[PDB]
Amino acid sequence: EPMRPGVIRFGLTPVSNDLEVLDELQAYLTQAVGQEVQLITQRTYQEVTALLVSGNLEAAWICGYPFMKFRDELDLVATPLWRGKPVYQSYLIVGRDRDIAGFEDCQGDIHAFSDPDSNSGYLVTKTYLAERGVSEEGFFRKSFFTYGHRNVIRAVASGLADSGSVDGYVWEVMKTTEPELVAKTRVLVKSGWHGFPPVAAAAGQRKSQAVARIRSALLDMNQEVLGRSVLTRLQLDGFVETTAESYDSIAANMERVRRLG
């Protein structure tokens, strides 16, 4: 009858030195949780989210958009803090020397999105379009998914995309780690503030021991040297407890896109 895995499984999607950060995060969570934690990476948000929703992961770091989409099947564990707050923006980016004044001038672009289930890499911009009565197929000459925010930036930097939609946290971090790459882009539009991508758990595992230990591992990550090392590399400050109401601005956009679709 019970169908337990051999280990605690923590899901995420892809993170420059990503192996170094992943190793440390895996070792930290193992050290904190008190037993082996395996990091399970999948390429897309809906793949990580479905694994979580089916109880095939004990927790996962997902986007607020899929979190709110599967809100009744999932519980929030903790939210990251960046620049002192559990919030971030979507940046609509163009080439550094592109002469244009605003978003409306991106009509006819080739546009790079990150993932159809990304708040900052799809939804926010999809909201801009829907508010103006258009979809990506109508407004742009082409759009595609890069399946990563670093890739959106590279797509715009290289000229394959005229414009892109990116996580503004990612853009700011890369500005410091790959400055010559990010200097080939510039921020055309910054969105409003949304809840930072949270760690969530299947709603059935609410009071489970693995979830409780994961949660403390996140909230106490600043109190251990290896935990601090992970936070430093991600340029994050820690994790805090939030409730679903922190994600209301995301749900509101989801509804605009539906209402107006």
Author numbering: 42 to 56, 59 to 304
The authors write:
The regulatory cluster consists of three genes, aioX, aioS and aioR, which encode a periplasmic-binding protein (PBP), a sensor histidine kinase and a response regulator, respectively. Arsenite-bound AioX is thought to act as a ligand for AioS, the sensor histidine kinase that upon auto-phosphorylation, phosphorylates AioR, the response regulator, which binds to a conserved sequence upstream of a RpoN promoter. AioX exhibits a typical bilobed structure of the PBP type II class. In this class of proteins, the ligand-binding pocket is located in the space between the two domains.
In the initial single-wavelength anomalous diffraction (SAD) electron density maps generated from the crystals of Se-Met labelled protein there was an unaccounted electron density in the putative ligand-binding region near residue Cys106. The electron density was consistent with the presence of a phosphate ion, from the crystallisation conditions, and its location would suggest that Cys106 might be involved in binding arsenite. The crystal structure of the phosphate-bound AioX was used to solve the structures of the apo and arsenite-bound forms of the protein by molecular replacement. On the other hand, a phosphate ion found in the binding site of AioX formed AioX-specific hydrogen bonds with Asp210 and Cys106, which in PhnD correspond to Asn175 and Gly65, respectively. The presence of a phosphate ion in the binding site of AioX leads to the hypothesis that the phosphate ion mimics arsenite binding. A comparison of the X-ray structures however, indicates that while AioX can bind phosphate, the resulting structure does not stabilize the 53–61 loop conformation seen in the arsenite-bound form. Furthermore, even though the structure is similar to the arsenite-bound form, with the main conformation of Tyr88 akin to that of the arsenite-AioX, electron density for residues 53–61 are ambiguous and due to the disorder, we were unable to confidently build a model for residues 55–57. Within region 55–57 the structure had more similarity to the apo rather than the arsenite-bound form of AioX. As we were unable to detect any binding interaction, based on the conditions used in the ITC we estimate that the Kd for phosphate would have to be greater than 2 mM (data not shown). As AioX and ArxX did not bind phosphate in conditions tested in ITC, we conclude that AioX and ArxX do not bind phosphate under biologically relevant conditions.
